Amino acid sequence: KHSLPDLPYDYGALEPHINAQIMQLHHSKHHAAYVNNLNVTEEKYQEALAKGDVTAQIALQPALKFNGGGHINHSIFWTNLSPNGGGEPKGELLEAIKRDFGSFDKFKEKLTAASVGVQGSGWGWLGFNKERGHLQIAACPNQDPLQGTTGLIPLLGIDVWAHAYYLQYKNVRPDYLKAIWNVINWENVTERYMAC
Amino acid sequence: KHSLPDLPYDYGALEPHINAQIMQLHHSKHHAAYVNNLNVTEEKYQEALAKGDVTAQIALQPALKFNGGGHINHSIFWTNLSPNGGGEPKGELLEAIKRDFGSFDKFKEKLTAASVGVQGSGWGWLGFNKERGHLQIAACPNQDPLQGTTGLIPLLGIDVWAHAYYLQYKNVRPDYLKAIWNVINWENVTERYMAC
Amino acid sequence: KHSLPDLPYDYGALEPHINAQIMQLHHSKHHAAYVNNLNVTEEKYQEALAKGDVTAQIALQPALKFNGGGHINHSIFWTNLSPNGGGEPKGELLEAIKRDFGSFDKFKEKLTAASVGVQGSGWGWLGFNKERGHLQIAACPNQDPLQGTTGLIPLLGIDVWAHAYYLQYKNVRPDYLKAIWNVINWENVTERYMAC
Amino acid sequence: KHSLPDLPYDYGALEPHINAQIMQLHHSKHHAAYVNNLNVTEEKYQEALAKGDVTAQIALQPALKFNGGGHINHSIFWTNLSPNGGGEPKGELLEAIKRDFGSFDKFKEKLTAASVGVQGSGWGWLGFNKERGHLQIAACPNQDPLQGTTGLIPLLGIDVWAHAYYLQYKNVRPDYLKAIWNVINWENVTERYMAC
Ligand SMILES: [Mn+2]
Ligand SMILES: [Mn+2]
Ligand SMILES: [Mn+2]
Ligand SMILES: [Mn+2]
């Protein structure tokens, strides 16, 4: 069982950067749909599994990756934002940032470039590479979850699906990316980082 | 060279089914971006080709498929719609429809199911199978063009990228699909069909 | 768990078309590995599902598809071959082949083309489409199973992984394809066809 | 056009690690086919580009990637091997390997893992990342070229297509990988490394 997580703010807490209408639809509609479909897919897989039905398992697994990934991605995203967010990180996170990307600006520039460049719906990720021990930027198609498909540990995600910005910024993703920086919860990103 | 095609109507000609704001953005912004990037990609490929630079050719070819496909898909789409559209087809097209899908309703039902089911951005296609000589429904991811990636001849396309309906129907694709039936130019679809 | 099925004949029963060495390697080494790995992966997957670990499930997915498909594909393949095979089929399978492909020779020409044209490792597939009600030819990459990833019901499968012909026909697949027609078990393909 | 490069040594020069039969087949049959097909595809592509036929270009894409990559990958591979190869590298390539992987043995352990773990046909790739400035290991499906699809500059390539080891090591890739370390041309990998 999986559930739709309650936000730690209210829908309008991020205005004017991300309007309340987007936050409400994104949470109670889009994320809700992924959780519901995820639960369905996984009561189905559990019975395909019990019967040893390999064909059903494999047919199931675009559904499970899309909805399961949708749940994982959005669950992290909500925690990645805050009405008291914005600014720059401090401590080991900032030290690591300029160590792997040169500076906070270069990092910001590369993450923005990765998110805006996604063809179609997708996500832009700052991740941690456990093996190599360094920060890394990656982009995922649709709702493919970062860790499950790449191995990298997710620290910060920028959702570039049209439903995350279109009603407010239309076709101009650059404006969407430029605005979100003001509400990123660097306190949460650092927590994620330290746990690695 | 490729150019942005002039519409055969004005932006508001399809109201209330598809509002004027969507038609304007979709044409002068989204389609325009694909044509521009397409032309860039193909003056680049032409010089990669002249130098025998295989690596550059292969690096180029997500760009070319995405923007080139974007141009092809939208160019057909505009002709697929009409303010005098709607209703049902007549002649050999309707005969072929119920012959391959049972009835116009079953067909309509399956095409709607294919479009609404697309994970992420994509297109739903009624196509013609030259080899087998029958109608066929297919769905393509992002801007992958039907013929170039499937071999099927495109007859009718339903664009399910959020930029084609979100401002008006939000997350409810079913409402978007239900509305578009009233402005489909069956006269154009039949032309496409007869040419096969 | 799953099991390596016994072969319906001796390893050297398909000579000279497919030598005993290949049959022995293909069955007792390759197919056995898929079963063993399939079981290890399923056990795994059962643990991830119990804990609701979506990430573990999504990460497990390529291992399960590859091994699950390996087991499925090969299990069908063994029954598709016979020392008393060869020639053409009779009954309605034959009429269906005429109806959907023109003639038996056109069918084998197209199934051979789909098999030889597989880039890298893969399978050429005669299948049945329940939706349309007709036979259809498809090719699958590596060990992706026909039904699970396509919806088509498998009738006859041709394995074009190098481990199925390289020792005997080297770089020449056409020679392999040409030879295999002599050991096709049409009785089995007919049974599979009458079942759906 | 493109050309099948001559081999820097005789076909039996890598014995007993890679027998003459494989080397002869791999070079004069497989690589030659990629070059020939690459040239036919390019000529083609030149015609489609002249006419501005986007559909023909997009349809041509898998043929060109597969053959173009085949030619690129194999051309690098021949220079990566030598009768006087084997042992370890010296100079800064060695320090870079220590710095980015810990030790030479950890590097070969990881490059071997990436190569043996390739599902189906593919390549294991040592590469250099110009953006980050460090060595990196990557695996590519079938004939997809490293640079063109990844951005990484190729230094050392290990071919795991069955046609590169099956005749000699059958189903056991680890034996093949274990053997190949004896003929690696570190002089060439060093030159490729110093160039970028
Ligand atoms: Mn989202
Ligand atoms: Mn569109
Ligand atoms: Mn096989
Ligand atoms: Mn090779």
- Using CA atoms, how far apart are residues B166 and B30, in angstroms rounded to an integer? 14
CA A117 – ligand 2 centroid, Å? 17
Axis crossing angle, helix C32-51 with helix C61-80, rounded to the nearest 10: 140
Minimum-distance CB partner of B120 among A25, A120, A170: A120
In 3D space, the residue among D147, D149, D144, D148 whose CA is nearest the CA of residue D160 turns out to be: D144
Dihedral over alpha carbons B154, B160, B163, B168 (to 10 degrees) = 120
Which residues in chain D are closer than 8 Å to B151, comparing Cβ atoms? 59
- Using CA atoms, how far apart are residues D134 and A89, in angstroms rounded to an integer? 26
CA D142 – ligand 4 centroid, Å? 9
DSSP state of B29: I
- How many CB atoms lie under 10 A from the CB of residue C191? 13
List the single best residue of B170, B175, B176 to mutate versus A (max A Cβ within 10 A).
B170
Using DSSP, state whether B53 is helix, strand or coil: coil
In 3D space, the residue among C75, C7, C24 whose CA is nearest the CA of residue A52 turns out to be: C75
Using DSSP, state whether A178 is helix, strand or coil: helix
- Using CA atoms, how far apart are residues D155 and B78, in angstroms rounded to an integer? 48
Q: Residue B97, Cα to own-chain centre: how many angstroms?
A: 19
Pairing of strands A122-129, A134-141: antiparallel
- How many CB atoms lie under 10 A from the CB of residue A50? 9
- Binding positions of B for Mn(2+): 26, 74, 159, 163
Cβ distance of D163 and C171 shorter than 8 Å: yes
Report H helices in chain B.
Answer: 20-25, 32-50, 54-59, 63-80, 92-101, 104-116, 146-150, 166-169, 173-180, 186-194
Range D83-196: architecture per CATH: 3-Layer(bab) Sandwich (3.55)
What are φ and ψ of residue B17, in 5° steps? -55, -45
Which residues in chain B are closer than 8 Å to D59, comparing Cβ atoms? 147-149, 151
In 3D space, the residue among B79, B51, B101, B87 whose CA is nearest the CA of residue B156 turns out to be: B79
- Using CA atoms, how far apart are residues A145 and A73, in angstroms rounded to an integer? 6
Using DSSP, state whether A114 is helix, strand or coil: helix
| Largest Cα–Cα separation, chain B | 54
D71 Cβ neighbours under 8 A, 6+ residues apart: B54, D2, D31, D34, D35, D38
- Using CA atoms, how far apart are residues C174 and B170, in angstroms rounded to an integer? 53
- Using CA atoms, how far apart are residues B14 and B12, in angstroms rounded to an integer? 5
Could you give the angle at the alpha carbon of B99 between the alpha carbons of B95 and B100, nearest 5°? 125
CA B23 – ligand 2 centroid, Å? 10
Which residues in chain D are closer than 8 Å to B148, comparing Cβ atoms? 54-59
D116 Cβ neighbours under 8 A, 6+ residues apart: D160, D173, D174, D177
Q: Which helix (H) or strand (E) holds B129?
A: strand B122-129
Cβ distance of A45 and C46 shorter than 8 Å: no
DSSP for chain D, please give it: ----PPPSS-TTTTTTTS-HHHHHHIIIIIIHHHHHHHHHHHHHHHHHHHHT-HHHHHHTHHHHHHHHHHHHHHHHHHHHB-TT--S---HHHHHHHHHHHSSHHHHHHHHHHHHHT-SSSEEEEEEEETTTTEEEEEEEETT--HHHHH-PEEEEEEE-SGGGTHHHHTT-HHHHHHHHGGGB-HHHHHHHHHH-
- Using CA atoms, how far apart are residues B99 and B78, in angstroms rounded to an integer? 27
Rounded to a whole number, what is the distance in Å from the CA of D120 to chain C's nearest CA? Answer: 6
Extract the tokens encoding D93. Answer: 């390539």
Three-class SS of chain C: CCCCCCCCCCCCCCCCCCCHHHHHHHHHHHHHHHHHHHHHHHHHHHHHHHHCCHHHHHHCHHHHHHHHHHHHHHHHHHHHECCCCCCCCCHHHHHHHHHHHCCHHHHHHHHHHHHHCCCCCEEEEEEEECCCCEEEEEEEECCCCHHHHHCCEEEEEEECCHHHCHHHHCCCHHHHHHHHHHHECHHHHHHHHHHC
Distances (CA, A) of B66 to A76, B19, B23, B40, B114: 29, 26, 21, 13, 21
List, as ranges, residues 42-101 from C with C-beta within 8 Å of D: 62, 66
Q: Which residues of C92-118 are buried (b: 16+ CB within 10 A; e: fewer)?
A: ebbebbeebbeeeeebbebbbebbbeb
- Using CA atoms, how far apart are residues A39 and A32, in angstroms rounded to an integer? 11
Q: Which residue has the tokens 């519409």?
A: B7
Whether residue C21 contacts residue C167, with contact meaning beta carbons closer than 8 Å, is answered with yes
Whether residue B61 contacts residue D148, with contact meaning beta carbons closer than 8 Å, is answered with no
What are φ and ψ of residue B130, in 5° steps? -55, -45
- Cβ burial of B165 (10 Å; 0-12, 13-18, 19+) is buried
Query: Where do the domains of chain C lie?
Result: 19-82, 83-196
Rounded to a whole number, what is the distance in Å from the CA of B61 to chain A's nearest CA? Answer: 13
Tell whether the torsion through CA atoms of C114, C115, C119 and C122 is positive or negative.
positive
CA B187 – ligand 2 centroid, Å? 22
Whether residue D61 contacts residue B61, with contact meaning beta carbons closer than 8 Å, is answered with yes
- Using CA atoms, how far apart are residues D60 and B49, in angstroms rounded to an integer? 14
Q: Residue B34, Cα to own-chain centre: how many angstroms?
A: 14
Distances (CA, A) of D53 to A5, B11, B95, D45: 50, 29, 32, 9
- Cβ burial of A26 (10 Å; 0-12, 13-18, 19+) is buried
Whether residue B69 contacts residue B30, with contact meaning beta carbons closer than 8 Å, is answered with no
DSSP for B57-111, please give it: HHHTTTHHHHHHHHHHHHHHHHHHB-TT--S---THHHHHHHHHHSSHHHHHHHH
- Using CA atoms, how far apart are residues B25 and B34, in angstroms rounded to an integer? 13
Axis crossing angle, helix B186-194 with helix B92-101, rounded to the nearest 10: 90
- Using CA atoms, how far apart are residues D7 and D5, in angstroms rounded to an integer? 6
- Cβ burial of B107 (10 Å; 0-12, 13-18, 19+) is buried
DSSP state of A164: G
What residue in A sits closest to C1 (Cα-Cα)? A52
- Using CA atoms, how far apart are residues D2 and C92, in angstroms rounded to an integer? 51
The full length of chain A comes to 196
- Cβ burial of D76 (10 Å; 0-12, 13-18, 19+) is buried
Minimum-distance CB partner of D29 among C33, C121, C171: C171
Whether residue B29 contacts residue A171, with contact meaning beta carbons closer than 8 Å, is answered with yes
What residue in B sits closest to D46 (Cα-Cα)? B49
Strand ranges of the sheet holding C153-159, from the earlier edge strand across to the other edge: C134-141, C122-129, C153-159
What residue in D sits closest to C34 (Cα-Cα)? D119
Rounded to a whole number, what is the distance in Å from the CA of B63 to chain A's nearest CA? Answer: 9
Which residues in chain C are closer than 8 Å to A45, comparing Cβ atoms? 49
Whether residue D44 contacts residue D25, with contact meaning beta carbons closer than 8 Å, is answered with no
| C31 assigned binding-site residue | no
B24 Cβ neighbours under 8 A, 6+ residues apart: B11
- Using CA atoms, how far apart are residues B138 and B127, in angstroms rounded to an integer? 7
D123 - beta bridge partners? D140, D159
In 3D space, the residue among D21, D16, D9, D70 whose CA is nearest the CA of residue D178 turns out to be: D16
Extract the tokens encoding B187. Answer: 């006269």
Q: Which residue has the tokens 């056109």?
A: C106
- Using CA atoms, how far apart are residues D46 and B51, in angstroms rounded to an integer? 12
Put simply, whether D143 touches C (Cβ < 8 Å) is yes
Using DSSP, state whether B127 is helix, strand or coil: strand
- How many CB atoms lie under 10 A from the CB of residue D57? 23
B133 Cβ neighbours under 8 A, 6+ residues apart: none
List, as ranges, residues 22-51 from A with C-beta within 8 Å of C: 38, 42, 45-46, 49
- Using CA atoms, how far apart are residues A172 and B62, in angstroms rounded to an integer? 22
- Third-level CATH fold of A19-82: Helix Hairpins (1.10.287)
Q: Which helix (H) or strand (E) holds A22?
A: helix A20-25
Residue type, A79: T
Extract the tokens encoding C177. Answer: 């394809």
Cβ distance of C54 and A61 shorter than 8 Å: no
Distances (CA, A) of A75 to A30, A79, C94: 12, 7, 55
Distances (CA, A) of B196 to A93, B88, B152, B154: 61, 20, 11, 10
Distances (CA, A) of B18 to A171, B29, D60: 17, 16, 36
Resolution, rounded to a tenth of an Å?
2.5
Using DSSP, state whether A89 is helix, strand or coil: coil
Minimum-distance CB partner of B61 among D56, D65, D72: D65
CA A165 – ligand 2 centroid, Å? 17
- Using CA atoms, how far apart are residues C52 and B41, in angstroms rounded to an integer? 45
Could you give the angle at the alpha carbon of D115 between the alpha carbons of C76 and C57, nearest 5°? 60
Q: Residue D78, Cα to own-chain centre: how many angstroms?
A: 8
List, as ranges, residues 145-184 from C with C-beta within 8 Å of D: 161-163, 166-167, 170-171
- Using CA atoms, how far apart are residues C143 and D120, in angstroms rounded to an integer? 8
- Using CA atoms, how far apart are residues D16 and C191, in angstroms rounded to an integer? 49
Cβ distance of A120 and B29 shorter than 8 Å: no
Whether residue D103 contacts residue D181, with contact meaning beta carbons closer than 8 Å, is answered with no
In 3D space, the residue among D83, D69, D60 whose CA is nearest the CA of residue D34 turns out to be: D69
C31 Cβ neighbours under 8 A, 6+ residues apart: C4, C70, C71, C74, C75
Chains in contact with A, where contact means 3 or more Cβ–Cβ distances below 8 Å, are B, C
Which residues in chain B are closer than 8 Å to D52, comparing Cβ atoms? 1-2, 42
- Cβ burial of D43 (10 Å; 0-12, 13-18, 19+) is exposed
Put simply, whether B1 touches D (Cβ < 8 Å) is yes
Strand ranges of the sheet holding A134-141, from the earlier edge strand across to the other edge: A134-141, A122-129, A153-159
- How many CB atoms lie under 10 A from the CB of residue B22? 20
Put simply, whether D142 touches B (Cβ < 8 Å) is no
In 3D space, the residue among B121, B100, B120 whose CA is nearest the CA of residue B111 turns out to be: B100
N-term to C-term CA, chain B: 26
| Equal fold, C19-82 vs C83-196 | no
- Using CA atoms, how far apart are residues D74 and D29, in angstroms rounded to an integer? 12
In 3D space, the residue among C114, B36, B120 whose CA is nearest the CA of residue A164 turns out to be: B120
Residue type, B15: E
Distances (CA, A) of B37 to B27, B31, B143, B167: 15, 10, 13, 25
Using DSSP, state whether A6 is helix, strand or coil: coil
HSE toward the beta carbon, residue A100, CA cutoff 13 A = 20
A152 Cβ neighbours under 8 A, 6+ residues apart: A125, A127, A128, A129, A136, A138, A146
Extract the tokens encoding A140. Answer: 């995922």
- How many CB atoms lie under 10 A from the CB of residue B29? 13
- Using CA atoms, how far apart are residues C88 and C86, in angstroms rounded to an integer? 7
- Using CA atoms, how far apart are residues B134 and B96, in angstroms rounded to an integer? 8
CA D182 – ligand 3 centroid, Å? 30
